[PDB]
């Protein structure tokens, strides 16, 4: 779990046996183009192993106690599957604060892609994120994930060569404030760690004590 | 560019004039009821349909998107006033109220819109097929219509953003960040204010 | 006129004896589960109990019929100020059953969405003098209480204590326990308005002067409106 | 008890007739300036020394400090109003405006303060000696007197609770337990309430 | 240092020597009666050796940890010194939220009291309190705190027998909000047991920011 | 045109070389206190140093004229927004000296009044270049940064970080080192008012349509007004 900056990578989400699982069903499936600069491929929202294989990545993902604690989530805009091969891209561009989900509206607190596709087996396709913090170019293994804020000005570079296959998503969190949510995550590491220490029980609860407190203060559900 | 008339933002040209004869031709052919003014009954099925037109083109409208955030509508109503027909001072979650205006103001004596603001007041009437959008606790009345009829579209809705500074603050940041996309501004700053008006966007919304 | 014990308040007879004996006749019926696994507490936890199943009909139907009498009860409302229940889990605890020490989830899913857990709840259902062992025992910054109440009483204490189940040894106790989200989110604005509520209550009972009460009343619900989160 | 006439109070009789004679017999001896209306420069001894006088009424007053929570008074000015002489609408840290009447409101033809509100608005002449409290940020004047003269004293001050609300809700739960307490209510719900009271006062107050 | 409900003791502030001390200048100087229902005995705010002693005392909590921790004070209504003996009492009452002081107005967030006789040589003077979460009598050795919210209904009981000698006073905390500044005192002496507790470094720097953060946020300076 | 390099930003040519070497000279020629305690650190530190006391009418003097000139300093004044300095304090750092891994305290005393240090400053009066180690290494949860900047420039960074000032080996490293209190409490909303304010100046430079410049400011000042704790 590598915390570079803004981002936040969570490795191996998936094996690579579950990968390849994945692929072999998402490879069957219709892939439509589209420019909604923009030049990619994409399974439609409605395509039935789409929506399935999103619910899997989505049921995952709330399993990982390390994403749960980092992002807080209250509500997945649901994964959409991307490719890009041949020079198509993404251009610069910012995202939309709110999203129109088939449940409702949410708040964009955060992006995430989920890579289905070894970064050696294609040239280019680097999620390159900038914001007031800095800039980083973002090109993760096959079953690993980068979870970053939404707010930032970013691109998915040509694919020269070869293929990238990925899960993209947004999620509203639980707690609107960067700020806020990083000191939560802070403080529950911080306890994790200490509880994987054998720190003195009565601590480990008077820090959970605070947490629970905060999250009360600070939860928007 | 279009700004802010103080606490109320006015959208012109949301129906050509041709697209409001259509409106009226269709309206004026209903059964008005006398529920003082008039208005057609809200499960009337033409004027359910004409309302769901209004909505459609609002909600097609960049302009309106930015000055309201809509997050839900309140099904548009079609009154009229004429002959002495009135409504007294009122406030009436609804964030925002807002006319669209189906009759020519030079057609009617009086029927002006007048709504409280901090500083005072504004009178309003506008071009058959433009828009006023007001917060709906503003203290309000329509005055007298001694001559001629206002045949208006009136509804409610609530907006992404409560506060009426915080939603006056964004849309006059977007219609500034357009206003400079227009005249082909350095990309960078383009993408910097952009980056501020959904961050504040964020830190405001309610869903 | 209810009081708080620290941080808890009991709300004494929220069902009668015959209501609690009715209750337990039709719930005593069911198909009680071995429960070791803990759902809800913040860190793993030794717990180790029976329930009825959350889908159980009967349960949700009683479960009902609690959240609805509480919803009627004057002084639970004024304490806890409602807005969304964690529908009602039964519990029981016997041979030695237990909850051991733990703090629950700031935040639980339920079937109408996401609530957070301002307040947790247990209604018994077993006379305390019925069972041996089996105290609620509630600490936290400003102390620590040993609860067993009365067949049909509800205590009412803040989610964010540490707390636990003391084996049961001897006889059973049955209760049905829950969470809900107040509409007003901070413990000290929830105490005033508990307060300011609660001496109306008594100036009406003992006959003060109408307009002060009507004034009185006008603060409370400015205060309430300030104060509510829905 | 004595409440609050929508966003602004009347404090009655905080100077007797004889009082407000003795004031005007002082302050009629002085040079008025022509700063449309007139006033004392605030520099002038006996305006200074009235103005302290003033001041020390107020604090000893129990329901104005209640209803102000005074933190700090800027020095009360005089002025004084006939012969078509007026001050339109404005809006004036200044929390609080008030002005102690010194003209019985039936001696002077116009002169009323009259007072934006988010209801509409209040056109106020108290009695000699009595004073009025309001907004800073309420939008105001004083209409023209046509005959007779109005003289006051007017003031600012920065308050406790900067809140209008905060402050009116404050006033009324204390108007009610001194009014329950010369109705010699229970004395723990006396002591209860009183508690509700400081732990607000606490909350909402900055110093 | 005991936490008992609503009210915090600090035990020991200065020894009995220096109570001894304390006492010698203090029984010197001239104790005024009034009724300010109240009757007992003070020393007047003015008296130079009753302004000296009040800041030893303000000096020595200023430089006592648990007690910064707890109160967080940011600024003290200088100490009073009073007496009550045979028959004086102080009845049932609520502090005023508001206090003026020499430099200024200050909010009463709490309320102090440093025992200068011993609780064996004086029969009654309890300190009784009255919160929502229930009520204590305070009585404590000599050289001993008590720490209390301003709100609470309180009262000196009628001292029927010898005499007792405290310094009161009230004090603005930094953080306005009784349940924040109870989450920070928990925060830090969470914080400090860890530290005493040897635990990893890194954790008491990760804690020790969470906090650093939390009381910038909530301070009103 | 001035960045955020993650969490801090450095403001170069505050002083020029000349400016810097007058400071120097003035500052040179006065009394240089060995100090081995700490004082501002949430823990016990491994502290040991030269500094000016703070009392030093030369110290006070300079003190006030770097405060002038960053006042003076648009950038400055835009990312920082300050509303009360802590007065600078002169240090120094020769033959093994170092400050180790603390936290600066978020409150501290200043002589007219307690201010909350949500900015750290360092001006560096001697060039990096000129002495070996000493670098300012500021941690946090978004990355660590070693900070030695050229003589007359500044560095700005929020007191929260976890921070040292590694041992200088040869040579001499003096500065002054200040905090602040913000207008503005929060750092993102501190961070957004700083962009704004950046984007703005640059569609002046860049010569943009004067309306939408006017519009734009008019948002700044609004949001200003809007967070400001005055
Ligand atoms: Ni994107
Ligand atoms: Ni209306
Ligand atoms: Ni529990
Ligand atoms: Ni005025
Ligand atoms: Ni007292
Ligand atoms: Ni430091």
């Known amino acids: 779990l590598y915390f ?12 690579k046996q579950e990968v390849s699982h994945l692929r072999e069903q998402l490879d069957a499936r219709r892939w439509i183009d589209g420019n909604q600069r923009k030049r990619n491929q994409q399974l439609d929202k409605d395509d039935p192993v789409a929506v399935a294989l999103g619910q899997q990545i989505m049921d995952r993902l709330l399993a990982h106690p390390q994403f749960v604690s980092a992002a807080l989530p209250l509500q997945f805009y649901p994964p959409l599957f991307n490719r890009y091969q041949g020079g198509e891209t993404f251009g610069y561009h910012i995202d939309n604060a709110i999203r129109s989900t088939p449940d409702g509206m949410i708040r964009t607190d955060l992006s995430a892609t989920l890579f289905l596709s070894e970064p050696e087996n294609y040239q280019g396709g680097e999620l390159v994120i900038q914001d007031t913090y800095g800039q980083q170019s973002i090109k993760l293994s096959a079953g690993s994930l980068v979870l970053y804020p939404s707010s930032s000005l970013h691109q998915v570079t040509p694919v020269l060569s070869g293929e990238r296959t990925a899960a993209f998503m947004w999620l509203q ?48 559900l």
């Open 173 to 220: 969190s639980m707690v609107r404030d960067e700020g806020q949510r990083r000191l939560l995550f802070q403080l529950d590491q911080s306890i994790q760690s200490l509880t994987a220490q054998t720190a003195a029980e009565q601590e480990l609860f008077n820090l959970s004590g605070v947490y629970h407190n905060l999250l009360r203060r600070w939860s928007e």
């Open 4 to 15: 570079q900056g803004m981002l936040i990578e969570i490795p191996n989400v998936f094996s």
